[PDB]
Design an enzyme around this catalytic site. Structure first.
Site, PDB file in Angstrom:
ATOM      1  N   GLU A 110     -26.035 -26.720  26.944  1.00 41.77           N
ATOM      2  CA  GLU A 110     -25.496 -26.571  27.996  1.00 41.77           C
ATOM      3  C   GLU A 110     -26.973 -27.868  29.003  1.00 41.77           C
ATOM      4  O   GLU A 110     -28.185 -26.543  28.641  1.00 41.77           O
ATOM      5  CB  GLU A 110     -25.220 -25.478  28.906  1.00 41.77           C
ATOM      6  N   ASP A 131      -9.521 -13.216  24.998  1.00 38.92           N
ATOM      7  CA  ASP A 131      -9.158 -12.827  26.528  1.00 38.92           C
ATOM      8  C   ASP A 131      -7.848 -12.210  26.676  1.00 38.92           C
ATOM      9  O   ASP A 131      -7.455 -11.072  27.253  1.00 38.92           O
ATOM     10  CB  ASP A 131      -9.603 -12.954  27.776  1.00 38.92           C
TER      11      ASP A 131
HETATM   12  O1  LIG Z   1     -19.524 -21.910  20.090  1.00 37.48           O
HETATM   13  C1  LIG Z   1     -19.722 -22.544  21.332  1.00 37.48           C
HETATM   14  C2  LIG Z   1     -18.684 -22.791  22.383  1.00 37.48           C
HETATM   15  C3  LIG Z   1     -18.929 -22.772  23.861  1.00 37.48           C
HETATM   16  N1  LIG Z   1     -19.579 -21.557  23.736  1.00 37.48           N
HETATM   17  C4  LIG Z   1     -19.880 -21.170  25.572  1.00 37.48           C
HETATM   18  O2  LIG Z   1     -18.266 -20.573  25.982  1.00 37.48           O
HETATM   19  C5  LIG Z   1     -18.206 -21.242  27.064  1.00 37.48           C
HETATM   20  C6  LIG Z   1     -16.882 -22.003  26.880  1.00 37.48           C
HETATM   21  O3  LIG Z   1     -17.211 -23.217  26.240  1.00 37.48           O
HETATM   22  P1  LIG Z   1     -16.140 -24.096  26.560  1.00 37.48           P
HETATM   23  O4  LIG Z   1     -17.235 -24.902  27.784  1.00 37.48           O
HETATM   24  O5  LIG Z   1     -16.260 -25.275  25.647  1.00 37.48           O
HETATM   25  O6  LIG Z   1     -14.770 -23.713  27.348  1.00 37.48           O
HETATM   26  P2  LIG Z   1     -14.001 -25.103  28.150  1.00 37.48           P
HETATM   27  O7  LIG Z   1     -14.888 -25.759  28.924  1.00 37.48           O
HETATM   28  O8  LIG Z   1     -13.735 -25.728  26.395  1.00 37.48           O
HETATM   29  O9  LIG Z   1     -13.031 -24.334  28.312  1.00 37.48           O
HETATM   30  C7  LIG Z   1     -19.177 -21.936  27.457  1.00 37.48           C
HETATM   31  O10 LIG Z   1     -19.843 -20.669  28.243  1.00 37.48           O
HETATM   32  C8  LIG Z   1     -20.085 -22.184  26.288  1.00 37.48           C
HETATM   33  O11 LIG Z   1     -21.501 -22.554  26.253  1.00 37.48           O
HETATM   34  C9  LIG Z   1     -19.985 -20.503  23.047  1.00 37.48           C
HETATM   35  O12 LIG Z   1     -21.092 -19.572  23.372  1.00 37.48           O
HETATM   36  N2  LIG Z   1     -20.403 -21.088  21.749  1.00 37.48           N
END
Ligand SMILES: O=c1ccn([C@@H]2O[C@H](COP(=O)(O)OP(=O)(O)O)[C@@H](O)[C@H]2O)c(=O)[nH]1
Ligand SMILES: O=c1ccn([C@@H]2O[C@H](COP(=O)(O)OP(=O)(O)O)[C@@H](O)[C@H]2O)c(=O)[nH]1
Ligand SMILES: [Mg+2]
Ligand SMILES: [Mg+2]
Lengths: 804, 804
Positions: free
Chosen positions: A202, A457
């Site tokens: 990020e 969840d």
């Molecule tokens: O392998 C991963 C991919 C994502 N995340 C984190 O978990 C959250 C959810 O990820 P994502 O943004 O992909 O969620 P989405 O936007 O797909 O609903 C975010 O804080 C990511 O940085 C993580 O810890 N591991």
């Protein structure tokens, strides 16, 4: 007799014969060894080179020592640790940077002390199990400190020093047993609220916004006056709230962290690369945790200090592993009262935490709560159809579904951010079932449990609700608004919805299968059990309707629009004219276009990743959107042309106007007016593309010291056998998961196809459309009743809570 | 001032603060260092432990030395090499096994000599480029030697000693420059024929059978009398043929070789694990080559000795890499006259080599030849339909296609085994284009060239035929029979045909695109160019017909059978009766079953590997086979019912009886009679399943010594950046290849669908079937003419070769 092998390595090519019959006689090898003097020159050069040590050599030796210790070979580990410690102690004098010199000296002394302790353990004087280097946390002054910053009160030790420690704990449940402690526990503070911010790949802006929003929430909690009926009491009262909140930022891996994020973290005094490189040389830590009380200043206004723990994991894992570390280690040690979970980039309003805590404190029966999720800046850049469609979807989903499910006290929380629990309902069995994948290999669990990926969840929610000998219900707080950032293109939306849909479908199946535990094991009131039974019937009907959505959409569009045009059922125009070729041409065009689009979509979705097929996805989406807009206009004309009756107006209301009625009741009516047109054009795209891709891509998922020659051969054979067995096991697991996903996809697709074919061939528009209208009206009426009930509860229980 | 860190590693948990402002003052660290005595005990224990060395430690140090040398760090490499050499020299005395003692002593002396040479190079006295340890091959007595074995004559050095050497050559073109030699070159022998046997993950039985068959061929070559007109003259004459043949067995990787195969190889004196483990410790070789003149005895009969070189590659690669090593290194060094390539398990008849050599010597214009491929034991276990279908396919393909293509002197050799070339036509440009993938990354080549996987034989053939300033033609030898082993189930056949079809399709496209080089660059006769033009037109027509095969099959079956039943065109039965519901029921059943089967097949093929979907593939194949058998019976009845005419009988002959006519002309008629029924039931399975799976799975394809702290940080940052860039590059390459394969599959599928739909809707059975009959009759007539011409050539040129 040894052959003439005096020049065998020096010369480019030498051919020699080695007789193995009876070995070489003694007194001959010694003469040849003593007859060579170039070995003396080589030894002299090597010794002269090896007089001077280096930092890189010491770090490499310590890494090799850690690798040897992990393999349970202790003599080699002791020797390598001694060499590394002596090398670092010798090197530390030469360095000119004071910080590097001090860190090297401390690390060398620590390594030497660990070597002494390991030698004592080997001799047998000290009896332990699985010895490891002693835990040692180092506090260093922060590089950048703001002189002009005003806060409540900060001890200089807390204000200027950042602490670091590497953790080797393999199973996070043992975090407190191995001797690790946090600064909050040591200082005497006992935080009552913990917030986890999972981060992976990020940019700095999202983290900065999240931290600023949390600081604003803390300021709002501080500002509230005491003695009011609506004001919180106790720890979260005022002027000391920042001491009762801890924020844990858990990163997913050093390899994938954005470098600018690391630079920003180092700027606010929460990361330092030199300390990490030096102090973690020999430990072989699984994670590295930095601790600080960061003081953030934005523009000319100074924010409240935030107690922060940044845990950076060495290797990449899933988000469930980050929650595993956070919950088990930190929650079991600190033992908080509440526990909030959010993603990075989720910006909270000033009153989110206040409303969450108010609900938790007032109700005393809530085991978990979720706030409202919103799209950041929806009105800005309104020309984008995807953003407006997502905004409408979020608003409608929140209002209708969350209100209906929260009336019965059972919420299937949407994936992503901002869910709070209390660390009394979830401490035992619910968390054990939450982390089931991380503790048991997928071979034992099977394909069904493994394919329940990114749905944990919902598992936690259902475990909390149906916990044995307890009655915990969930709740939905409308005023805890959290604003996220949504994808602006179709490809990111497709991937996100793939994850969401896989998780949602398999979690729904699990909940439906295990719903009996509420009556068999839990301890609720009789009225609660009856309400849960009613909700179970509704949930079964809703899931069954949702499974057959593509076929119903195709049948509705086909019948209404095209069998109105062909068979003269459009009221605003007459088709008794025309050559009978145009009508069949329209029907055939519709059928062939729909079939070709579906075939292309399924081939692409099963075939390749949806990032290089952007043009084809956009083309199919545009075709479906134009078709849906034309169908909407035709339906509006048909409805307006009819003089209308009681049945027509009632069905129209209960089918379409439920959204507007609920939105107007809750006050969020303007968003629906703005985004209804944008959402209408994406219904076929949503259904077909997202469901097909989600189903198609379901497969995606996660000691001898010396020895002799015979020992070496046996060791290598054993290693090869183990490697081949592991490869075979992984292949079998992949095969089973792929077979399960293919079976599920085939069942779904062929059920929909057969249903559509039979309805088309053996049923008319007069004998099918009323049934669909009845079904849709019933579902929407139930949802509207749920929303009205939730509104009545949220606006009445305050006034009528005195009696009960 | 340093804090109280005396007990920081020994204690379980210690918290310390390290001030980085101004470093630690001197005269204080020295006192603390000298005040600790446990370090003395640890050092004493480490020294006592380290007095005694071990074999495993020495081998590990040598491996680390090789790793350091590969990274171009020479001081560390020299130090590690010295340590390993001294350790091995000390250890060698303690060993009790004489072979191990001698090998360890020799390896230690070689390592010490290499250390001396490297020290001289570092000092600057010796000037070289990229120094490496000197090449050294070791000959040892064979463990098992048969006292009772009778052969022509064998020197004891050749008879009892096996030789071994590890090769580091990174680019095989440099094999002779680095100083490596083979035993044949050293002994003075100059073999004229080389045979390559590529092996990977195979049982001992196949290799044993292949070696026995080669020995039988050598015996047959020896037995022939001199002075006959048909007898060969020169090297292959008699009583010394075994000296003019070398057999190279190239394995694909130590990890994947079957252990029983290694045991068998060690039995015949061609492998030894101790020698490989010891002599290859520090070299870091890419490959290991053993050399012997193996003497095989079967039952009570002794076979002729075979000069064999077994080259075992350390890491796994493609078969093209094995051919790269074989051709470049061994062919460029030995410089043979011919070069035969075959797979392991291919059993040759007694006269295969004789016929190949006879054709090569008599014609003098042949640049390459291929023998006939047959199924081993076809009549045995005749109940198996897959084996009989494969046997029929092999026989028909060989006869018709090979004869027709060999009449024009241009053969697209079928994948697998037994193709011979002469090492004069292929030495230059054809081999450079053959190994284009192994020298250039797929990013530069593009997706089209990369997707031409496992089709390199066709590339070599076309390069030989169209070589500039040369006129080389290919030939097909009918009497060089080679018998292989075929899969007995549908899943192995599906995988094999996937590989074959990908290669064949893209190689055919490449040849069609580059056919102009024959006229522009090559130097042929005018008649040859005109014949090549005629063959080019035929090839275009044949490929265009083959591209639209599923649609034509569906149209033929539908029209004939089902629109005969529905519209009363079956001659042996009348359907003017019936309720008009049964007829439409039959047509709809056919259409729906075909569509559902195709959808299931494409979903499965794109979805998962075809080993866990065995039941579904078997079910679809059985349904298609029953449909095809019913259609065949209906067509036979229709044909027999008609009184028949000139057109009917001519079309029937030229369509069906061409196979029988050609087989009877060539004498292989009984196989066709036995296997025609079995092959008929698998035509739809072949076409649909194999083509769909092949198209769907097209994506499948292949220095600072010391430094300071800032140097370490920069090195780690550079490593991370390089790793991320490489990951991005690999992702982009995969994306491009997947996009290309998806585009090709979509084009093929939609072209077939649209063609079938348009022919069904806008054409009748009367206006379409005659065109299909004309097309099929024309193609089969051309193939029959080619076969008859090849037979006339092979039976006439002997008699009429005197004049020309
Ligand atoms: O392998 C991963 C991919 C994502 N995340 C984190 O978990 C959250 C959810 O990820 P994502 O943004 O992909 O969620 P989405 O936007 O797909 O609903 C975010 O804080 C990511 O940085 C993580 O810890 N591991
Ligand atoms: O990665 C591989 C796979 C196979 N082979 C060898 O190349 C030949 C062809 O392999 P295969 O049996 O798969 O051919 P197919 O039966 O598929 O036509 C055989 O001698 C294999 O041992 C190889 O060298 N490398
Ligand atoms: Mg996010
Ligand atoms: Mg084979």
């Amino acid at each position: 007799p040894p052959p003439s092998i005096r020049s065998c390595g020096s010369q480019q090519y030498v051919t020699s014969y080695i007789p193995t019959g009876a070995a070489f006689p003694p007194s001959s090898v010694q003469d040849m060894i003593s007859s060579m003097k170039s070995y003396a020159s080589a030894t002299d050069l090597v010794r002269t080179y090896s007089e001077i040590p280096s930092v890189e050599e010491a770090l490499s030796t310590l890494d090799r020592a850690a690798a040897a210790l992990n393999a349970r070979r202790y003599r080699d580990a002791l020797k390598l640790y001694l060499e590394g410690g002596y090398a670092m102690a010798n090197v530390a004098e030469r360095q000119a940077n004071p910080k590097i010199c001090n860190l090297l000296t401390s690390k060398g002394f620590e390594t030497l002390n660990w070597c002494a302790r390991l030698c004592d353990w080997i001799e047998g004087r000290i009896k332990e199990k699985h010895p490891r280097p002693g835990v040692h946390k180092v506090g260093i002054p922060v590089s950048n400190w703001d002189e002009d910053w005003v806060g409540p009160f900060m001890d200089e030790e807390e204000a200027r020093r950042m602490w670091y420690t590497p953790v080797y704990c393999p199973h996070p449940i043992d975090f407190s047993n191995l001797g690790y402690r946090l600064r909050c526990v040591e200082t005497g503070r006992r935080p009552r609220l913990m917030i986890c911010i999972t981060m992976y790949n990020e940019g700095p802006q999202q983290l900065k916004a999240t931290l600023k929003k949390l600081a604003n929430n803390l300021a709002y909690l501080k500002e509230q006056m005491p003695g009011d009926e609506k004001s919180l009491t106790g720890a979260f009262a005022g002027d000391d709230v920042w001491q009762n909140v801890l924020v844990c930022i858990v990163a997913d891996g050093r390899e994938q962290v954005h470098p600018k994020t690391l630079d920003y973290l180092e700027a606010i005094g929460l990361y330092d690369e030199d300390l990490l490189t030096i102090n973690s040389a020999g430990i072989g830590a699984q994670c590295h945790l930095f601790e600080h009380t960061l003081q953030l200043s934005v523009n000319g206004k100074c924010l409240l200090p935030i107690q922060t723990v940044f845990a950076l994991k060495e290797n990449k894992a899933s988000k469930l592993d980050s929650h595993h570390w956070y919950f088990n280690a930190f929650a079991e040690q600190i033992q908080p009262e509440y526990t909030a979970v959010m993603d990075v980039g989720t910006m909270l309003t000033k009153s989110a935490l206040y409303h969450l805590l108010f609900a938790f404190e007032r109700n005393h029966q809530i085991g978990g709560a979720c706030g409202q999720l919103t799209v950041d800046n929806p009105f800005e850049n309104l020309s984008n159809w995807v953003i407006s469609a997502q905004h409408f979807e979020y608003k409608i989903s929140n209002i209708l579904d969350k209100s209906l499910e929260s009336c019965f006290g059972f919420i299937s929380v949407l994936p992503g951010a901002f869910s709070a629990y209390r660390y009394e309902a979830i401490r035992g069995a619910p968390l054990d079932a939450y982390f089931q994948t991380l503790n048991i290999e997928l071979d034992v669990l099977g394909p069904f449990i493994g394919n329940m990926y990114l749905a944990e969840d919902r598992i936690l929610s259902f475990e909390v609700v149906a916990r044995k000998n307890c009655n915990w219900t969930m709740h939905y707080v409308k005023d805890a608004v959290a604003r996220t950032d949504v994808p602006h293109d179709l490809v990111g939306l497709i991937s996100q919805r793939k994850r969401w849909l896989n998780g949602a479908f398999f979690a729904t199946l699990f909940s439906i299968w295990n719903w009996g535990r509420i009556y068999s094991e839990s301890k609720h009131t009789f009225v609660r059990k009856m309400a849960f039974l009613v909700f179970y019937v509704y949930h079964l009907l809703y899931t069954a309707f949702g499974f057959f959505l593509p076929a119903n959409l195709y049948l509705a569009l086909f019948f209404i629009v095209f069998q109105g045009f062909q068979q003269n059922r459009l009221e605003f125009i007459d088709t008794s004219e025309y050559s009978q070729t145009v009508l069949d041409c329209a029907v055939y065009i519709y059928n062939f276009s729909y079939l070709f689009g579906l075939l292309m979509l399924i081939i692409i979705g099963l075939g390749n990743n949806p990032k290089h097929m952007k043009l084809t996805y956009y083309f199919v989406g545009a075709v479906f959107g134009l078709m849906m807009m034309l169908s909407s206009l035709v339906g509006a004309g048909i409805f307006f042309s009819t003089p209308a009756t009681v049945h027509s107006i009632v069905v129209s209301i209960l089918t379409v106007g439920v959204y507007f009625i609920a939105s107007a009741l809750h006050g969020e009516v303007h968003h629906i007016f703005m985004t209804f047109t944008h959402y209408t054009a994406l219904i076929p795209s949503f259904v077909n593309i997202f469901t097909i891709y989600s189903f198609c891509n379901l497969q995606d998922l996660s000691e001898t010291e010396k020895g002799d020659f015979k020992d070496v051969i046996a060791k290598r054979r054993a290693l090869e056998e183990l490697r081949r067995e592991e490869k075979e096991r992984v292949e079998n697991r992949k095969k089973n998961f792929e077979a399960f996903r293919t079976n599920v996809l085939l069942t779904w697709a062929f059920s929909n196809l057969i249903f559509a074919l039979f309805v088309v061939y053996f049923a008319s528009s007069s004998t099918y459309m009323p049934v669909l209208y009845i079904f849709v009206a019933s579902l929407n009426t139930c949802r509207l009743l749920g929303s009205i009930g939730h509104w009545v509860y949220i606006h009445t229980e305050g006034l009528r809570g005195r009696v009960i």
